[PDB]
Design a protein around this nucleic acid. Structure first.
Lengths: 158, 187, 173, 223, 75
RNA sequence: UUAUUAUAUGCACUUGUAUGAUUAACAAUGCGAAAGAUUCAGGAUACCUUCGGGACCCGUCUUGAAACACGGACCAAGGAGU
RNA sequence: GCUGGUUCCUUCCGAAGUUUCCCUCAGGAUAGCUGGUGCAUUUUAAUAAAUAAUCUUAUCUGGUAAAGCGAAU
RNA sequence: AGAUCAAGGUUAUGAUAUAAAUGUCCCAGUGGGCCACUUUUGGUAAGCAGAACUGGCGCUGUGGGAUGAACCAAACGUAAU
RNA sequence: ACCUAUACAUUACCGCUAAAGUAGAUGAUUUAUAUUACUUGUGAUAUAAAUUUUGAAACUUUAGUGAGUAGGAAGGUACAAU
């Protein structure tokens, strides 16, 4: 008739994977984390010192205060319905690095550079993305084994 | 058929002065004409500010008439204030300045005139600077007042500081349980 | 409709690990152009991996059978779903046009077995000459000279007079 | 000293109106010869690729025409939102849509209230000539001449004539987004002869989803 | 009695009526609850920012007091 | 070079076409008619006559009232957010 | 904290039966929803090199459908 | 982590904008809900009981289902076509 | 084929909502004509006649648009007194 409290229904949020138990690999303490960086939260089930609660595992947000061995992240939590900006402290192994900026930061380089090679030829930029267009009009030869190749059913008898 | 236009398609504003004042309801009649035939944005913000209440036309002491003017480089820019210019005794020596205002307290009219500059109604402004060239259109703070000190209040957040509706200031008046960490809790 | 006939050809759009993917074709009876192009994929989602869009529809065309005033008797192979009962059949009709004897199938298969036409699949349609037609209601329409005096009209009821005057005495002999 | 001023205005407004008409003639002449070299090329490419026994696919279609077909009640808040953003809020409203992967997955979502298909030139013309209206600060101004496209769109695009609208829409140009959002959605009326089911797909019954050549023949009886 | 205690019908139609209200995007944000020095250090560097044009060049001449910095590339 | 198109029509003058939400030209019928008095159109005004169509009794509480729920036979005066 | 009533006409907008607490369960307070009244103003405000909400992209998370017992239990 | 200089092309998916942003009056009412697709628990079942989602009824007339609170169409200023 | 809604569409009208325009009238504007500067040509001057207020709390232009209990706001309306 309940949940309440603080770690309920975490038989699979903080379960370990198949055979990734054991000593946490030591790169997790070695990562550098800055202020304003973006970060994910997967609560690591083998470290009880300040897990995120279950309402923040899965959620990304911006660091804005780093300490000795934990980080104070800003995670958007939807309440009803006024989305709040939370201010969560978590440790390091309950955090990963985002990748969602990482593609864009290589798009900022190239749009700086696709205009840089076009700095000399002049024209023209064509910087912004497009979603998938229709392909074109082709024509395709068989050329290579003319048609039929002809699938026709016979699908029951069984 | 179409879903929708709901609401508020009725936009929200005030469109004539609620003062039935026969002097104010004539400066409006003028300044309609000085912003539909000279499309300045200076003259909108006089027609818009001839409309508002007396909250939203807050007083602006004689020192901020002067304290702003002496932010320099315009030594013949008349000071345009859609409201009241009261008097600051904490200013002692007042610079010679030219003032446009709806109302001027007489202890400020006796001082500006003595310096001596001008005091202008808003029809002498428009007959002098219709487009507002060389003017300084100011307004005192709309939340200067103390009705605004009480907006809005959860004790439980670390940021409220917002002033109950008590009857009286003292101990044994809302000072005990829920304010002190001994009695009850600290809010 | 009347179920025209098409020949609809597929592609598997050509992603770089394999260009030139191998171009299968079908023979489709549909009432219209664009529903022929969606029978094709329902009948591609059983034989090849290949869906849309992982594939294309390269040139289709509507075909216009060869001899529209010969009196060939078709024999169609068929697969259909019952209330409980996906079944093979094999049916035969006489028609001048091929898509006239697939639509002859549908309005008969749909009547005699209740067979709604989304649970019928055509798995062969060919002209079958004579002396291979089994199907007794075909091979009684074979023997020239066939005499058959079924004095037949619709005998339009009644005619341009509702309250007629003349009592229409059908036989007229 | 006024009558000197106005009759120089009045004779330079004449020379600019004269220098639009010829510049909107030979511009409609150039745009028309495109739509003859285009469709004759696709005849030329097929009568080529037959004799070389290749398969000539034609081009996949950009430019749909999307028309709300069915009903303003009982609709769910994610088909409620796509059909707002397609500007299709009434029954028998239609907008022009550029087709990519990113709106086709939106026509998939709003699929049971939409019939669509890819329009003829005659359909592009007859929709802006007979039914075609225009946004002048949220107002629905009709056409009545081609000053009313020359006003808002010649200075910041190069559309000035009515056939420049048709050219920027049949050949889905760089200013497509400006010249579909210029046109207020086409409040068509109810097709004479009718619909078929309105609420079974076009492949089954006949309405919603891609008709894909037969938006032309529907729009005949709708416009 | 027992008809309807604790339902969620009409609860996201309400929460999507005066709608779902993203927070903000504030240029500056509160440093309330940050590391408390850290912030006293940045409150000391904020006061000592004195050179806009004047001393900011000058200390390069002081780098040349060791003819530059050949040695300290290590630590 | 084969074609195609536009520009090179001012001065007068029309009962001319367009465009100012593009309806107006022709006829017929009949006289506001001195007071006196007809013609043509219209009038579910508030009813009676004739037909067609629709059409359950209000107020209330209620998830749901025409309800086999409660109040109300009818009428004038009074009568409840200061 | 319950029953009954609560007297003009048009015009505009238009709900809730949920949350937390209560000797609370036919009631309140409380937030959500509502109207009013403003105000500030944008090359998404008045003669955009920037916001905002369904798809796309990119990237995180999940242990239900299906699958499994010739993997653990 | 900041404070001022130097360089920067065409502003960096699509389609949308019936205006959006924000205070106050946290002002009125409400805090008995019922119905339905798909999901679902108790019960043997129930026009029963209890939840998740979306849409409706409540508040809503009109067209259709002879008939009907919720079904299917469709949402409603006075009229012609 | 065809019949059928208070839906769709084009039009008239009512409201709403959102924009936009108008106030030198000892001025503006016509039509002619006398004179004229003359620029060929078009303006400026004299004459004769003509049109040209609006509770600007008004008038004019344009577009979209209309469900509603509980409930709130605006504008009217009946009664009686100062």
């Amino acid at each position: 008739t309940n949940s309440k409290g603080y770690r309920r229904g975490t038989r699979d949020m903080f379960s370990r994977p198949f055979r990734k138990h054991g000593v946490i690999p030591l790169s997790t303490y070695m990562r550098v984390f800055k202020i304003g960086d973006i970060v994910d939260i997967k609560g690591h089930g083998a470290v009880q010192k300040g897990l995120p609660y279950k309402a923040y595992h899965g959620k990304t947000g911006r660091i804005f205060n780093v300490t000795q061995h934990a980080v104070g992240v800003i995670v958007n939590k939807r309440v009803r319905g006024k989305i709040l900006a939370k201010r969560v402290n978590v440790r390091i192994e309950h955090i990963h690095h985002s990748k969602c900026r990482e593609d864009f930061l290589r798009r900022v380089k190239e749009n700086e550079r696709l205009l840089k090679e076009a700095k000399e030829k002049g024209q023209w930029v064509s910087l912004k993305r497009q979603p998938e267009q229709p392909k074109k009009a082709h024509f395709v030869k068989k050329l290579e084994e003319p048609i039929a190749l002809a699938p026709i059913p016979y699908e029951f008898i069984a | 058929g179409i879903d929708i236009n709901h609401k508020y398609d009725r936009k929200v504003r005030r469109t004539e002065p609620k003062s039935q004042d026969v002097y104010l309801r004539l400066l409006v009649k003028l300044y309609r004409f000085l912003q539909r035939r000279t499309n300045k944005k200076f003259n909108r913000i006089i027609l818009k500010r001839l409309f508002m209440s007396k909250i939203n036309r807050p007083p602006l002491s004689l020192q901020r008439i002067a304290r702003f003017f002496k932010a320099a480089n315009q030594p013949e820019s008349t000071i345009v204030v859609v409201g009241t210019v009261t008097d600051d005794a904490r200013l002692l020596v007042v610079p010679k300045l030219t003032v446009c205002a709806l109302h001027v307290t007489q202890t400020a009219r006796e001082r500006i005139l003595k310096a001596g500059g001008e005091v202008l109604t808003f029809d002498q402004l428009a007959l002098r600077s219709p487009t507002g060239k060389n003017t300084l259109l100011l307004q005192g703070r709309r939340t200067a007042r103390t009705a605004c000190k009480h907006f809005g209040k959860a004790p439980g957040v670390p940021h409220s500081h917002t002033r109950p509706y008590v009857r009286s200031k003292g101990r044994k008046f809302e000072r005990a349980r829920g304010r002190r960490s001994s009695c009850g809790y600290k809010k | 409709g009347l179920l025209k006939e098409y020949e609809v050809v597929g592609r598997k759009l050509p992603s770089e690990k394999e260009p030139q993917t191998p171009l299968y074709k079908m023979r489709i009876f549909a009432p219209d152009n664009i529903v022929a192009k969606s029978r094709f994929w329902y009948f591609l989602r059983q034989l090849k991996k290949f869906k849309k869009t992982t594939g294309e529809i390269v040139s289709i065309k509507q075909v216009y059978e060869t001899s529209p005033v010969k009196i060939k008797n078709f024999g169609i192979w068929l697969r259909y779903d019952s209330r409980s009962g996906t079944h093979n059949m094999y049916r035969e009709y006489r028609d001048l046009t091929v898509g006239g004897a697939v639509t002859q199938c549908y309005r008969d298969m749909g009547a005699r077995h209740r067979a709604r036409a989304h649970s019928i699949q055509i798995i062969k349609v060919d002209s079958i000459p004579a002396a291979k037609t089994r199907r007794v209601h075909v091979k009684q329409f074979h023997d020239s000279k066939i005499k058959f005096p079924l004095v037949q009209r619709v005998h339009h009821k009644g005619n341009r007079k509702l309250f007629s005057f003349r009592k229409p005495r059908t036989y007229f002999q | 000293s006024k009558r000197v001023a106005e009759s120089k205005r009045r004779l330079k407004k004449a020379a600019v109106i004269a220098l639009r008409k010829k510049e909107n003639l030979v511009r409609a002449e150039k745009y028309q010869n495109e739509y003859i070299k285009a469709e004759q090329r696709e005849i030329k490419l097929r009568r080529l690729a037959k004799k070389r026994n290749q398969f000539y696919v034609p081009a996949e279609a950009k430019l749909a025409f999307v028309v709300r077909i069915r009903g303003i009640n009982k609709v769910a808040p994610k088909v409620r939102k796509v059909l707002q953003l397609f500007r299709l809020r009434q029954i028998n409203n239609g907008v022009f849509i550029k087709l990519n992967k990113a709106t086709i997955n939106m026509l998939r979502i709003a699929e049971p209230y939409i019939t669509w298909g890819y329009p003829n030139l005659k359909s592009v013309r007859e929709l802006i000539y007979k039914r075609g209206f225009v946004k002048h600060n949220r107002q629905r101004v009709p056409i009545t001449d081609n000053f009313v496209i020359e006003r808002k769109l010649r200075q910041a695009h190069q559309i000035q004539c009515v056939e420049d609208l048709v050219h920027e829409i049949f050949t889905v140009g760089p200013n497509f987004k400006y010249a579909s959002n210029f046109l207020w959605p086409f409040k068509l009326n109810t097709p004479t002869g009718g619909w078929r089911k309105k609420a079974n797909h076009y492949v089954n019954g006949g309405d919603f989803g891609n008709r894909e050549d037969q938006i032309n023949r529907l729009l005949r009886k709708m416009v | 009695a027992k008809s309807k205690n604790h339902t969620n019908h009409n609860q996201n139609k309400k929460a999507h009526r005066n709608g779902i209200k993203r927070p903000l995007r504030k240029r500056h944000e509160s440093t309330l609850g940050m590391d408390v020095k850290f912030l006293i250090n940045q409150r000391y560097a904020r006061k000592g920012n004195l050179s806009r044009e004047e001393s900011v060049k000058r200390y390069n001449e002081r780098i040349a007091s060791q003819k530059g910095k050949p040695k300290p590339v290590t630590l």
